[PDB]
Amino acid sequence: IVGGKVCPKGECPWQVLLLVNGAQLCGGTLINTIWVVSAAHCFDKIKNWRNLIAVLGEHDLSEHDGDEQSRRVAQVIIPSTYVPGTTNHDIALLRLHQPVVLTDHVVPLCLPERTFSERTLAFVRFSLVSGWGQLLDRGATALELMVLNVPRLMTQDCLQQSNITEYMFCAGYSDGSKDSCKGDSGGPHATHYRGTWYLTGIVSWGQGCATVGHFGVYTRVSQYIEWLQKLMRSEPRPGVLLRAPFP
Amino acid sequence: ICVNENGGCEQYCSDHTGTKRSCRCHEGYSLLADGVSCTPTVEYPCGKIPILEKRNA
Ligand SMILES: Cc1nn(-c2cccc(CNC(=O)Nc3ccccc3)c2)c(O)c1-c1cc2cnccc2[nH]1
Ligand SMILES: [Ca+2]
Ligand SMILES: [Cl-]
Numbered sequence A: 001i002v003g004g005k006v007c008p009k010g011e012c013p014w015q016v017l018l019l020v021n022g023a024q025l026c027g028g029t030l031i032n033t034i035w036v037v038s039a040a041h042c043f044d045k046i047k048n049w050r051n052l053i054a055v056l057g058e059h060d061l062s063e064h065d066g067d068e069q070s071r072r073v074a075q076v077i078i079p080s081t082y083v084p085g086t087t088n089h090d091i092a093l094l095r096l097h098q099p100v101v102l103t104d105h106v107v108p109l110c111l112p113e114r115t116f117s118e119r120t121l122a123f124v125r126f127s128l129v130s131g132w133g134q135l136l137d138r139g140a141t142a143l144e145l146m147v148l149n150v151p152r153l154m155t156q157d158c159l160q161q162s163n164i165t166e167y168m169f170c171a172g173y174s175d176g177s178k179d180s181c182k183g184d185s186g187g188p189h190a191t192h193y194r195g196t197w198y199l200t201g202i203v204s205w206g207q208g209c210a211t212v213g214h215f216g217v218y219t220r221v222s223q224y225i226e227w228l229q230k231l232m233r234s235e236p237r238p239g240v241l242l243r244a245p246f247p
Numbered sequence B: 001i002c003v004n005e006n007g008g009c010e011q012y013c014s015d016h017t018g019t020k021r022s023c024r025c026h027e028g029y030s031l032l033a034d035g036v037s038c039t040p041t042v043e044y045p046c047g048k049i050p051i052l053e054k055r056n057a
């Protein structure tokens, strides 16, 4: 996150940190005790699928304070329509090997109904994007969980103000001040409505961050609700990586 | 209608045949008798921030 602030500890309780061999991979979003939503691209290069760790209740990466909860990733589910090294259908559903324990510091974000998400949430101007990504373009990553308020653009308006599909949306600023960025991917775009927070977006990717004349690109989660819901009701299959048809 | 003002619903909303409308609530919530409002039924419902909820309790 560029141009953001520190998320006070426990105020981003749905935020997930993904690790590979102890190394920062990506972000994620907790939607249930065993389910995490992330970005498909995060997994393009995964060699040993068995070394994937999800961390909940994380905040300051430099310390252990005891609120942290680590789980192995038992399943990574990706839409069939996703092509590695691209942007379209940049979504992933992760199954935890064991449920996390809900606490003050570990809470899931509401996965909304499609209709609600479409007719209502999609019109809430401002939403919150978070992560432990780069603080700066070509910069170091954050030790402390960062958050950023970003406005959402209609796709028409996005293009005017500038490959955007119906599976994406634009959010942010073009002045180059404020953006989500490398290391943030798979993180939540979280939208408030009537005292509750919802999963509207996933930090995808693009060229740079905080690139003048550009807007941040996010996976349009509303497009995936039914797909996600069906998967969550399904029995685990052997092998970590699973390609599931979309729609 | 659900398309307008969210049908007055705090959360989820379904249109029915006629001038009929049904509000709903996410798991870990219950619908109040006003037929629009949702209240938590659990300690840690989704999309709520405990330290902030407690800060106002
Ligand atoms: C760059 C970049 N690299 N990863 C990355 C993070 C984790 C695993 C993999 C491995 N996947 C792979 O290499 N696929 C692939 C496949 C074929 C060709 C090239 C790449 C990449 C990112 O998240 C970004 C990223 C940029 C960006 C800008 N603004 C907002 C967010 C942003 N995120
Ligand atoms: Ca820590
Ligand atoms: Cl099944």
Ligand SMILES: [Cl-]
Residues within 6 Å of the ligand: A049, A239, A240, A241
């Ligand atoms: Cl495997």
